[PDB]
């Protein structure tokens, strides 16, 4: 049964060797796998504006800050789920949300 490929391109287009790939996609229980680089837009300061960050989102003005972080934070709120502080995921620079 293991007669081999006849890749001798003296034929027409129907017998040609093609660099093929087979994307086989199925689902298991562990998410957050290979996904897409969603185009990474700019920033803005000192004007109220909609924003979407890596999971959390809101709308307001983005300005400077005196509060400090550590190597792990992605979030910030003063009291009672009022989100106000984001160190940005590109410049790694701390901001406030008024």
């Amino acid at each position: 049964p293991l007669q081999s490929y006849g890749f001798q391109p003296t034929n027409g287009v129907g017998y040609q060797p093609y660099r093929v790939v087979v994307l086989s996609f199925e689902l298991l229980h562990a998410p957050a796998t290979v996904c897409g680089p969603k185009k990474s837009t700019n920033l803005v300061k000192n004007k109220c504006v909609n924003f979407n960050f890596n999971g959390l989102t809101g709308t307001g003005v983005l300005t400077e800050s005196n509060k400090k972080f550590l190597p792990f934070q992605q979030f910030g709120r003063d009291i009672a789920d009022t989100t106000d502080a984001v160190r940005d995921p590109q410049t790694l620079e701390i901001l406030d949300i008024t």
């Binding site: 550590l70 792990f72 910030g76 003063d78």
Partner: protein, 206 residues
């Protein structure tokens, strides 16, 4: 044996931070003022339980321990995770391996990953298929007991595996550790001005 798990089983509840609050939550935790079992580093590798994540620590500075032995039945018919101290990279392999009465290093693969005066204080937990790495490397001064004091734990790495809760063996080398378990207790924490845990209180203690 047993010692007093004073306060030090406490970590940041998620990748997630407030500042200067008194916030409450619930997760699996080491309860305060409980017994915590003490063991030796003779020459052994005894049999210890593993109850839904552990608080682990040891007093060392000279690379006695080498990692942890995971696997649902631990005899090369298992989906076994491995942790290897290299002195270069804490590497993680999810394969099948052969284990003995003393499997260590001294003087069907599916996942791969590459990264006394001190306490290397680690907490592993496995919620919803997510294996998490909660750590603290702190310096101390004495050797025989966990000190009357305070510590916090920080995250390192999330890993989706989902295999082990019953038991284990562990890793040593030729040339003393703390182990205490988790249970769901509603708490109350404190973030400081910096948003680090400085003190907390177990609700169901007294």
């Amino acid at each position: 044996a047993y010692t007093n798990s004073f306060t030090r089983g406490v970590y940041y509840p998620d990748k997630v931070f407030r500042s200067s609050v008194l916030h409450s939550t619930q997760d699996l935790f080491l309860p305060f003022f409980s017994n915590v079992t003490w063991f030796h580093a003779i020459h052994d590798n005894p049999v210890l339980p593993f109850n839904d994540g552990v608080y682990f620590a040891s007093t060392e500075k000279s690379n006695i321990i080498r990692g942890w032995i995971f696997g649902t039945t631990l005899d090369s018919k298992t989906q076994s995770l491995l942790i290897v101290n290299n002195a270069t990279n804490v590497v993680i392999k999810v394969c099948e391996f052969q284990f003995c009465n003393d499997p260590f290093l001294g003087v069907n693969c599916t996942f791969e990953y590459v990264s006394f005066k001190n306490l290397r204080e680690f907490v592993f937990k496995n919620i919803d298929g997510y294996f998490k790495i909660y750590s603290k490397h702190t310096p101390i001064n004495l050797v025989r007991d966990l000190p009357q004091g305070f510590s916090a734990l920080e995250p390192l790495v999330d890993l989706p595996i989902g295999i082990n809760i019953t038991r284990f063996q562990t890793l040593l080398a030729l040339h003393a550790y703390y182990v205490g378990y988790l249970q769901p207790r509603t708490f109350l924490l404190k973030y400081n001005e910096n948003g680090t845990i400085t003190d907390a209180v177990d609700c169901a203690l007294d």
